[PDB]
Amino acid sequence: MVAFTVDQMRSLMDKVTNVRNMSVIAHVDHGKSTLTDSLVQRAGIISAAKAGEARFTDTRKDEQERGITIKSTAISLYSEMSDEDVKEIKQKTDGNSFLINLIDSPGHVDFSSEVTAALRVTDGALVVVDTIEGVCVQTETVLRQALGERIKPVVVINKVDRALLELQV
Amino acid sequence: ARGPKKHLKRLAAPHHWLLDKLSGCYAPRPSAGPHKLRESLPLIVFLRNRLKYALNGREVKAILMQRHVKVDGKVRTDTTYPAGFMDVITLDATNENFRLVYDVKGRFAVHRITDEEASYKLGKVKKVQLGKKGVPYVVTHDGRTIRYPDPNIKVNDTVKIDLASGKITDFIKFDAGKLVYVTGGRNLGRIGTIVHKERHDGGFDLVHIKDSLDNTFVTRLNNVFVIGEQGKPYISLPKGKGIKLSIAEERDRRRAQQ
Amino acid sequence: SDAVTIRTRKVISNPLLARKQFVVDVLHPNRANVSKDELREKLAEVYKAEKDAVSVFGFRTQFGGGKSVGFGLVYNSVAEAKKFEPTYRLVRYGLAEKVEKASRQQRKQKKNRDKKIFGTGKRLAKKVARRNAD
Amino acid sequence: MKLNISYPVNGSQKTFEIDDEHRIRVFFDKRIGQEVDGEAVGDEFKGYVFKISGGNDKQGFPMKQGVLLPTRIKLLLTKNVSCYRPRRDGERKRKSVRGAIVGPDLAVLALVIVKKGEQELEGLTDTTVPKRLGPKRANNIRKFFGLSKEDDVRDFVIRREVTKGEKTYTKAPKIQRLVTPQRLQRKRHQRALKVRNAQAQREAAAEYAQLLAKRLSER
RNA sequence: GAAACUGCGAAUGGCUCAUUAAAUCAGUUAUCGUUUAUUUGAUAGUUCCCUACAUGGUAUAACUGUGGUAAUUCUAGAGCUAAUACAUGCUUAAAAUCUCAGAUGUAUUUAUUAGAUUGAUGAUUCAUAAUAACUUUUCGAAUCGCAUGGCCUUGUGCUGGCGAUGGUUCAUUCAAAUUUCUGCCCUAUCAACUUUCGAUGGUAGGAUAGUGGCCUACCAUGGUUUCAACGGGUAACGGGGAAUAAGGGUUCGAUUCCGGAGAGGGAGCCUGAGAAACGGCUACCA
Ligand SMILES: Nc1nc2c(ncn2[C@@H]2O[C@H](COP(=O)(O)OP(=O)(O)OP(=O)(O)O)[C@@H](O)[C@H]2O)c(=O)[nH]1
Ligand SMILES: [Mg+2]
Ligand SMILES: [Mg+2]
Ligand SMILES: [Mg+2]
Ligand SMILES: [Mg+2]
Ligand SMILES: [Mg+2]
Ligand SMILES: [Mg+2]
Ligand SMILES: [Mg+2]
């Protein structure tokens, strides 16, 4: 619970240049809610022991039992960083800490309306791409919607462990 | 129920305070003190509703906390202090003294008194009893206990307390023909003279009272209060002298101002 | 000028509050709702004291017009005026103005969050920051 | 495993995360108020005798110094006990406390040095924490300074220089039980009141008995 | 002036009407059968078997510092630190009488005496006093603000104000608890009920603050009842009151005031003057 409870977190939220309202988008089975799990573990909200399987953003009973995502659950996180690299930011900056407002979109094609809502409501997009499956149809669709909504993507290539332990490349 | 109550709901207050029905939900609960709950007058009511000095409770509290009000010779800064029958309220600003006595209808009328007579205050002998170590004492109606009293003082007598030393200067003995003042009941506020005292052992002692206009009414011994000798009151009587005129005569007196 | 006749009835002088209480009976033909400020000024002039120990309030305008009746206060001095006037009347008049405090609900939740923390904030904030930062 | 090691003489404390449970097992089956040999805890602890006083297990439960169990139990705690601060006068609450016998379930053990041996250790003896608050009451500060009664302790008292606003105004403790002319006046006033009441009441008794004799003379 | 300790309050208020049919409640009595914080007034020269010009840490909070836990108004260890917190502990002679030099204030408990025909009551073993004693020791300010004065061997002097708070007891006041008399809707398709496990009473004790089968031991065989006991039903909290109202009535009254009960259901209990408290705790059931 790094997580300045609500009050100091909102105090930083007042500084509206070191806040990021971003949404994570990917293909159906590209592993986005697990990456958000690993990101929210550092907020002290879920144990590390249970990060990759406690899909904290997947909140519905179905979302947890079937290992899928349907709705978009917003999670808001506190982030401390170093003085050195905040100088290496091409953005207005006041302070050395940040507030991230993350949206965990569904990957399935049947739930792209939640991705559209998240894009309309956010401004940065984290595009998760499995290294094995590469660029699939749903990642194409979500990146197309983000570019239609004028949202800058940043790409993370996932499942390198799978590529290393299964493909032996 | 589970403890002493600390609020006094309006419409449960004593009637003679003449409180407005629709000002609030509550009436000033008399704090614990000398006289009683029912037959006392809080300084809040006496200062705001009887004298119209204060506009509200904050101003009554300010009056009391600037040591202006002084009851029975002491400041009595409590906002709901139970000032009762014949209590002397001395106000230094607007230097004037009140004796809190029943009017003819039974309410505390606003009755100015002089300083030389306001030096003292009068008390009904509630009991006479020999205390510890063999020291006799007298308890008066106003909760005052006085040591070493005259051995001839019995129950239902009356004593004048100096109010500076709190000691007996002179006293009236309860006998037929003594000026007595009615301190309860339907006849509350009436002044007369004892003619007869029916005993009724075990029950309630009765007394028959014949007022100055020869009207005779009987009241229980508990609420009859001697104030001296006929035509010679040892206290300053109110403007009405406790006559209890019939409504027709009262209406005629009102109509005489025309 | 308009015959704005400010009658003052029922004058009770209570030096207990160092003050004079009365009823003001402003007769104002052909004009409505006489201004509280000009009531204050005229009463100060009539009672030979500054317009800081005179107060007027509670004005009901007579049905039909031409008359308004309220209550008036006259302190002997501005100091006791400031001590005895309620703060709302003082702020209306122009004396020490209103305190900018938060909403009652906020205040209540604020003290409710204080009700949890036992000592001063520093002894627990050190531990909280240390722990969260590892 | 963590250990809060404290060195009370001259004041100090700090924590050691110990691991390699082989070099933890000596701290097992040990009661509270028991001494341990530092050698088994480590060769850098040669000559350290530690008195164990409490600790916290995993899941944060404080341990009770007299339960004598290696498992945590629910106990109804009272005003004058550990592990419970009553939130209302007379309140008693049932809380789970850890037993007095220390085992692997303990997250952190609390231990105080009661003997120093070999080469000193960093942050317990090189550092020294001064006492936060000097004596305030007259006779406590007298006993602290080894003075006698008639030594006028006002002349020198513990004085802290808070150089805050470029004045360096110094604050010293207020003195309690100080012999004061005001306290002596209060004592004299109380004695005078008692004697005056006694004399006045005796005079009243005499004159009332005189009145009784006078009124009984009429027979 | 943070926090904290201390103190006080949180037992009021407010809500609701589930239980409850002689129960609550209304009017009327009693406490000569009890507890009472607070207020108001009065009241305590008696203690000591090398500190009183003022005692102990047997004390600690807050704060510093080391923390555990996911989390709670969670807390442990280490370092202090105070009091009207906790615990101790004298100075007041003088006046005075009994016992063989001591004791004689008050508080607790018992016994005896007085309490008259030297106080009160309608009435007492009452108030109260005295005597002989007994206390896992009660109180009899080791407390605080503001002013400083009078004397004088001019000292670190002796005396001395107004207040606050504390405190034993008594009275009073806010009260509380029991309590007398009479008065509740329908029902006999309820006529006998109660009493082994208290029912009615006697004695003794226990417990209570006090009375009392309230509980126990012994003992008696009682007590309520067609003037309706007991049982059953109430979509019954009681009353002040409300609607309609020639008179008489009929119906309603969960609900602005008073009284009672309860805080999902039962039970138990801490603290406190006051709670069987639930915006207190503990446990069982849901
Ligand atoms: N080998 C490997 N598997 C991964 C990795 N990340 C996720 N997975 C697996 O991929 C599955 C999908 O994970 P999710 O958290 O549901 O994320 P998602 O694929 O975006 O699913 P949706 O949110 O429903 O779209 C999980 O069961 C993981 O086991 C990875 O980095 N390496
Ligand atoms: Mg997911
Ligand atoms: Mg799947
Ligand atoms: Mg009652
Ligand atoms: Mg019902
Ligand atoms: Mg009703
Ligand atoms: Mg109902
Ligand atoms: Mg009610």
Ligand SMILES: [Mg+2]
């Ligand atoms: Mg209740």
Ligand SMILES: [Mg+2]
């Ligand atoms: Mg409910």
Ligand SMILES: [Mg+2]
């Ligand atoms: Mg309860």
Ligand SMILES: [Mg+2]
């Ligand atoms: Mg409640």
